[PDB]
Write a protein that binds this ligand. Structure first.
Ligand SMILES: *[C@@H]1O[C@H](CO)[C@@H](O[C@@H]2O[C@H](CO)[C@@H](O[C@@H]3O[C@H](CO)[C@@H](O)[C@H](O)[C@@H]3O)[C@H](O)[C@H]2NC(C)=O)[C@H](O)[C@H]1NC(C)=O
Ligand SMILES: *[C@@H]1O[C@H](CO)[C@@H](O[C@@H]2O[C@H](CO)[C@@H](O)[C@H](O)[C@H]2NC(C)=O)[C@H](O)[C@H]1NC(C)=O
Ligand code: NAG
Ligand code: NAG
Ligand code: NAG
Ligand code: NAG
Ligand code: NAG
Lengths: 171, 316, 316, 171, 316, 172
């Protein structure tokens, strides 16, 4: 994708994440664990189900039309009848092809983006208390128990509390 | 001591390959098909009112071929013509056959209203052993074969005003005898001629003497014509022989009605979209079943499959 | 001490809702409408030359119905036919009416040039009380009703070369009498024929006897036909009765001319785009007023509104 | 948006900013103030105005066409005339729907982008003399009067002048 | 000390301008043209089979104008009609000329099979100094001009069953004499009539006596009609004068064949796509050469150039 | 572009880069040099050549169609034929116009993206041992010979080896 996170600095997806599209894994003095991120997941999901339907309208309802198969040779008028349909079909065939190409590119790019926003947001909370290890992981330079991890995930982490300690381990 | 916090995304054991602007094939976690490519093979009889033509074409039902008279005064949302249909009455042709078929189908009804025409100095209700009705000789139910009475066939001159607030469709015809002997035996005049007109339209037909290929015992033919008469207008019919008279008029309608050619059986089930192959679901935006459709239908495309990604890239 | 530096973006008290790829409705600071959905209800008389048909159809003007003779030799960019139009001359029909109306409308002129045809042995300038011109009998101005002279009607045979460098349109006709008595009284022959041809085309018409519904006192009719003659080509007219002769030809043109049906009044104002509803602005790319348009016009679509975002997300 | 600035880490827009699309707010020893950024504002505006016109050309000029309304039933030829126009209208209707969808998405993402590019540009000038507070604000770790603020906005800020002071203050 | 590590991208000394969503003109390192705007000016004779009509139209070849008989039994993928083409046989017209031309072009062959029609009581193989074949009088090769025998022209009545497993195309005609003297001299009857039919079709034509413009010595005309007969069906021909009889039938085919008007020379070279201007390459997706095309061809667009970027922004 | 690298914080391209689309220039105690980045380059090239062909299929094959030029006025039927062809041409002309506009924007944004990603990836290896100078160049705060430079370019640089040396230089 355009942002280089998914299939990028994030080395692979987690088959073990079954309650969300995006989330966190940690290791600390109390062991390891995993948690989904709800905001990014719902943001991606909400954009995604509605998309075929926003474009292409509802179906159109059509009734009596023109004949499209013929049992006798007729010449000029049938030629035109056949040409009109052939013309219609080719244009619609083009529309379908282009539509799916564009939508799928945007779907891949939008999911990549949501991952990246979460990464930067997590990073920004950590301030000077962590370093980007380059593989989508942050090394946190202070003791950070289960409650500390949870404060980051729910967005209430207070960088100032740990700054003296964190700077101390780093420097 | 410290900690590590890793960000990631989910994945699945096998995803779906899709196409993008940048990739002919790329793996995502999930996708959905946008082209309907299958049918049950049956036409659903709901929600549209389906009329199975069985052994009859729409024109034969219109004219009133006897084995088709079951269809008298019928209505439909979709008229279904079967490949096994056959004619079993007087051999005929219709100049502009295709247009008449279209306009009746769109009207969506065979409702017919008899009128009390008076035909002075001619014999009414002619029939033929080429067109049996029950055990005896017969003719189209909606048409009236006029011939001489005694030794003469006078100039017919009859009128029918439209004082109604709908359009009337009159179906009528012209007999083409195979020989001069036939022509004179029936109509006295050596050549007949038929003219039907309204206040803003007119049609004149000259009958044709001669042999055509033998069909059901007969080398003669009827040509079918039609005339629409609007409210406040009037019909006039004038002939000195060879006239195949109307018995009344068809009530015209506008609406969602149409006609389709299909050999699909008719099942009891519900589908908005009908094709000659059978009904198809209309949950997908496109279909590759048939360019011919009726109702609320996906759009026809040439491609037989198109995958829409519904998930992120799959990177196990 | 130290300092703080914040980055931001603008917002407004109320923005516009628009649709995107990711939002069915999302708020931005501003947007602009892409669908023209209104008209003043009047057709602007500039820059295009508008001709109000008033009480006349284009065909009635062409043929020269007396109350339409005001339109003689007129030109137009757009001819406007009114629903109040009426015919007030000899009752007539035009086979392929739609085609004649179209081809005259596209030429964009009624410029007419009289030619010195010679009609030996017939009476010219026939007229009718169905088509009075002042207190007396008269006829279409561009047409010449020929009848017998003395007790005979010879085979007429006249020719007219095109020595100009433009196409000529010839309008001519066929009389259909109501009775055999009338046929022989006018034309002597029991059956006529009219043949008009060029070097690569020919048309032959056989007249029709019989009663039609009374229209302006008359049960007879005229059928109108046309023939185009190219530079270096030639017109030949051959008839032994029932011919309604041309008086000359129409100069044909090519260009941007057309015809429209409308009851909209014609105002003094300027608009490039004309619809039957009235003129509309052409600043927007789309319109939902009418599928029928003339000039530099937005494209017709079904939607009545489409918003193009012209600003960022609105986040108050 | 894809970049996560507008309606993202920037919590809201400024209704009081009436002379630009993007700009700056500050607090220092001399008080507070506000100024628009001209380059970012103009980049978004320039892409946005001429944009309807890049696609669909000029209006097309068309004159004599086909009839589209009919006063009599005719069957086959009227069917074809009606089908041709109906076919044309649905295709154009599709083009219009898709066009505004793509354009509006692109307008939202590009406007989000201009915000993000400006943020990244400002950050890079400040080097080690400031920290990203995660809400589109920089904490500047040295005394920074009005002329100092103006130096950042116009792109001539010299990080080296303050580096000793700032590092001292940060750590 | 230390080091510096700089990231960058390439650029080139020229660069090319393209259009984007955000720029009307922006410089990239490279681009490619998507509109084909040129032709060599020659139609390539491969891979499609080209038949150069030279002095002949397809219709003149069909009927068998003598200077066109080189084309007997020929086949083509593309028939090329030249603006310099001319007729040199009996002056004729074809009602619905365009349809016959279309269906033959599509059929893709002039393969002709003589049948043993029997024409009792008439003189066969009529000819004219308007249609010379070598030094003497002649006629269309595929048609048989019947005239009186002795002092009479009887009622002709012949049949031809289709016992093959392909469709037969029959070409036949009707003579329109310039004078009454001519009509009776050739056909004895003052008026002829021709009726040709199958089991579901019929056509009756009445000749029309009178002058048309003088062409190659003749003020008379032939009108050409055609009838297709399917397997198991049958042809009947009935005439008492003015009949131009078939000598047999053309075998109908289906396939990829068509026809084109061009003055382009025919060169030896290979191209899938043919236009009236000459062949063009089909590597680009669009073309601005001609809306008329045949084969595997780029799509016609109005634009004469469209550039697809194939490189990054060019920032020297 | 959307990412602000090409024609952005990278001030201009290198006409002297003739063996790649993206790459590196360095300066150290042993002189200067340049190297293409193969991985980024191939990613851009692969998306771009495949791009015309992904949409529009192969060409369509068409044979017998309708006539599109006429030598005689005919009225109603000729009108419809001409309207049908004109309608088709205008729709396709729109598709072509829109297609190149969308494609070219995406190529510009995608090339910009690749430049930006490479910059970010390089930055992440360097950790606390370097600083972004803001013009797409990194200042490296330790001795870094040709093999050290090569270790960065080929993705095997070990930031821990140099961290003590580097931190001392940055902050002291
Ligand atoms: C003109 O020639 C045609 C063709 O020969 C004649 O048509 C033929 O008419 C006879 C007698 O009506 C038909 O005979 C019947 O055939 C059917 C089916 O084959 C058979 O079941 C009957 O028992 C009877 O034999 C014959 O089929 C028919 N031929 C064709 C090709 O249709 C026509 O009678 C001639 N007209 C005149 C005025 O002489
Ligand atoms: C009907 O009139 C036309 C025109 O006068 C006649 O055509 C002329 O025919 C002669 C005899 O061959 C030619 O030499 C002339 O060139 C023709 N004139 C023109 C102007 O083309 C035609 O012959 C007449 N028909 C009858 C049956 O008398
Ligand atoms: C539907 O029927 C048509 C007509 O025989 C056939 O050509 C087509 O393949 C059928 N479609 C499917 C999906 O079976
Ligand atoms: C919104 O855009 C329209 C069209 O460009 C413009 O006329 C109007 O002044 C704009 N409004 C604001 C508040 O910018
Ligand atoms: C234009 O006039 C037609 C005819 O009355 C009407 O059906 C249509 O709704 C009108 N359109 C608008 C936009 O008023
Ligand atoms: C420009 O792009 C075309 C299209 O792929 C390619 O064939 C050509 O080699 C390129 N030119 C240069 C100088 O890179
Ligand atoms: C092809 O010929 C036509 C007819 O003269 C001309 O208008 C058109 O410009 C030509 N096209 C090219 C590509 O030369």
């Amino acid at each position: 994708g355009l942002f280089g996170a998914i299939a990028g600095f994030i080395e692979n997806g987690w088959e073990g994440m079954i309650d969300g599209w995006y989330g966190f894994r940690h290791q600390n003095s109390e062991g390891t664990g995993q948690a989904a991120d709800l905001k990014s997941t719902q943001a991606a999901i909400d954009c995604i189900n509605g998309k075929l339907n926003r474009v292409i309208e509802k179906t159109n309802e059509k009734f009596h039309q023109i004949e499209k198969e013929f049992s006798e040779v007729e010449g000029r008028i049938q030629d035109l009848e056949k040409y009109v349909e052939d013309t219609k079909i080719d244009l619609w065939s083009y529309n379908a092809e282009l539509l799916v190409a564009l939508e799928n590119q945007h779907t891949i790019d939008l999911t990549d983006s949501e991952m990246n926003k979460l990464f930067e947001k997590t990073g920004r909370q950590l301030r000077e208390n962590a370093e980007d290890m380059g593989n989508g992981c942050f090394k946190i330079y202070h003791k950070c128990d289960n409650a500390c991890i949870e404060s980051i995930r729910n967005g209430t982490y207070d960088h100032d509390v740990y700054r003296d300690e964190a700077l101390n381990n780093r420097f | 001591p410290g900690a590590t916090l890793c960000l990631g995304h989910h994945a699945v054991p096998n995803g779906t390959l899709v196409k993008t602007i940048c990739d002919d094939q790329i793996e995502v976690t999930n996708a959905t098909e946008l082209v309907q490519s299958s049918s049950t093979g049956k036409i659903c009889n709901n929600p549209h009112r389906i009329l199975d033509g069985i052994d009859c074409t729409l024109i034969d039902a219109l004219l009133g071929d006897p084995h088709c008279d079951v269809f008298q005064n019928e209505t439909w949302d979709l008229f279904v013509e079967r490949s096994k249909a056959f004619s079993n009455c007087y051999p005929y042709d219709v100049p502009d056959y295709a247009s008449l078929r279209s306009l009746v189908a769109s009207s969506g009804t065979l409702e017919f209203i008899t009128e009390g025409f008076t035909w002075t100095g001619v014999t009414q209700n002619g029939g033929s052993n080429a067109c049996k009705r029950g055990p005896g000789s017969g003719f189209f139910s909606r048409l009236n074969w006029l011939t001489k009475s005694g030794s003469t066939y006078p100039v017919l001159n009859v009128t029918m005003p439209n004082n109604d607030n709908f359009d009337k469709l009159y179906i009528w015809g012209v007999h083409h005898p195979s020989t001069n002997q036939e022509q004179t035996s029936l109509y006295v005049q050596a050549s007949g001629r038929v003219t039907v007109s309204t206040r803003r339209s007119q049609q004149t037909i000259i009958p044709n003497i001669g042999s055509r290929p033998w069909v059901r015992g007969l080398s003669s033919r009827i040509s079918i014509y039609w005339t629409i008469v609007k409210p406040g207008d009037v019909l006039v019919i004038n002939s000195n022989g060879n006239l195949i008279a109307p018995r009344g008029y068809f009530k015209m309608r506008t609406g969602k009605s149409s006609i389709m050619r299909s050999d699909a059986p008719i099942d009891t089930c519900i589908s908005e979209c009908i094709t000659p192959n059978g009904s198809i679901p209309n949950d997908k935006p496109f279909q590759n079943v048939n360019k011919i459709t009726y109702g609320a239908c996906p759009k026809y495309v040439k491609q037989n499959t198109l995958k829409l990604a519904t998930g992120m890239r799959n990177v196990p």
